């Protein structure tokens, strides 16, 4: 039946496997019934707590298949955005909403955005001499900004000791950049968060379209024409960047983005909360070895 569904890779593209952060799926283990579920009370148990059936298995199942269940699907005239997040709900499904608001609870969408803007400022602040940076100022951010999905602003503003020779806008992993042409004194960074589904676009195409949309918006306020849009997909554990690059920027942001996606504590808390609402484990401790 695995072979008839198309293989294990085709099955798991439907799921939240990539948001866990695990590398492979041969040691996946779901929590079983242990005998400690009602090991908190003795007789001090109401009729609902003795007879009523636990919600936690339905939520566990629904969270697992949630990019297929909450897929973008067909347009119905509008979409509902979950408050204090940028998660769009593509139907009225109550079991999904509870396990998503459990994951993004105590303002985790705002806290993820602040941690990464904070980490990029601490990396630029140690590279001031090599890249010829006057100063790095993280800006005063409206509290709504991290989960406003139609417009943005800059998060970090950069200023040159002399001058920067920047290439035209390209992706973070392309290798053929000229740096001849544009001269700038000022660069910015915009950090975008995203929670996608089965029908979403790729992170690369997403950052490029929002960059081209916002820099010609007449709504977003940027300190200069030149900058970088860094996008992070929270549901699939992915990132990309798009923008103008000077000599030294690309390599610096490539390595810094790799270590933030593994060591940032807010992102680490996000993956840990996703793991607990899934109730999934690893069979082995020997994978780093």
């Amino acid at each position: 039946v695995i072979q008839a569904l198309g293989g294990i890779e085709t099955i798991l593209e439907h799921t939240l496997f990539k948001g866990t952060g695990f590398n492979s799926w041969e040691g996946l283990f779901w929590e079983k019934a242990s005998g400690f579920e009602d090991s908190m009370q003795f007789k001090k148990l109401t009729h609902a707590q003795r007879t009523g059936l636990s919600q936690i298995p339905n939520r566990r199942f629904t969270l697992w298949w949630s990019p297929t269940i909450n897929r973008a699907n067909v347009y119905v005239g509008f979409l509902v955005q979950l408050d204090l997040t940028g998660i769009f709900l593509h139907g009225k499904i109550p079991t999904l909403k509870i396990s998503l608001i459990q994951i993004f609870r105590a303002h985790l969408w705002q806290k993820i955005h602040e941690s990464i803007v904070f980490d990029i400022c601490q990396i630029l602040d140690g590279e001031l001499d090599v890249l010829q940076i006057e100063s790095v100022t993280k800006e005063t951010v409206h509290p709504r900004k991290s989960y406003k999905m139609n417009s943005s602003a800059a998060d970090i503003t950069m200023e040159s000791v002399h001058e920067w020779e920047v290439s035209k806008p390209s992706l973070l992993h392309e290798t053929n950049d000229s740096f001849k042409g544009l001269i700038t004194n000022k660069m910015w960074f915009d950090v975008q968060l995203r929670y996608g589904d089965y029908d979403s676009h790729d992170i690369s195409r997403y950052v490029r379209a929002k960059f081209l949309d916002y820099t010609t918006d007449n709504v977003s306020m940027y300190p200069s024409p030149t900058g970088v849009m860094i996008g992070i997909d929270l549901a699939y554990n992915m990132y990309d960047a798009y923008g103008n690059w000077f000599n030294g920027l690309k390599p610096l942001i490539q390595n810094s983005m790799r270590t933030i996606m593994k060591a940032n504590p807010a992102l680490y808390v996000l993956r840990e909360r996703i793991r607990k609402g899934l109730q999934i484990y690893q069979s082995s401790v020997q994978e780093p070895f």
Binding site: E26, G27, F29, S283, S284, Q286, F289
Partner: peptide, 25 residues
């Protein structure tokens, strides 16, 4: 039985310093 062998095994690989030192020396 389980679907994957990785469920049922405890250790994927354990370094046996006894046999590896006998083979070297």
């Amino acid at each position: 039985n389980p679907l994957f062998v990785q469920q049922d095994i405890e250790s994927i690989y354990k370094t046996n310093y006894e046999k590896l030192d006998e083979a070297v020396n």
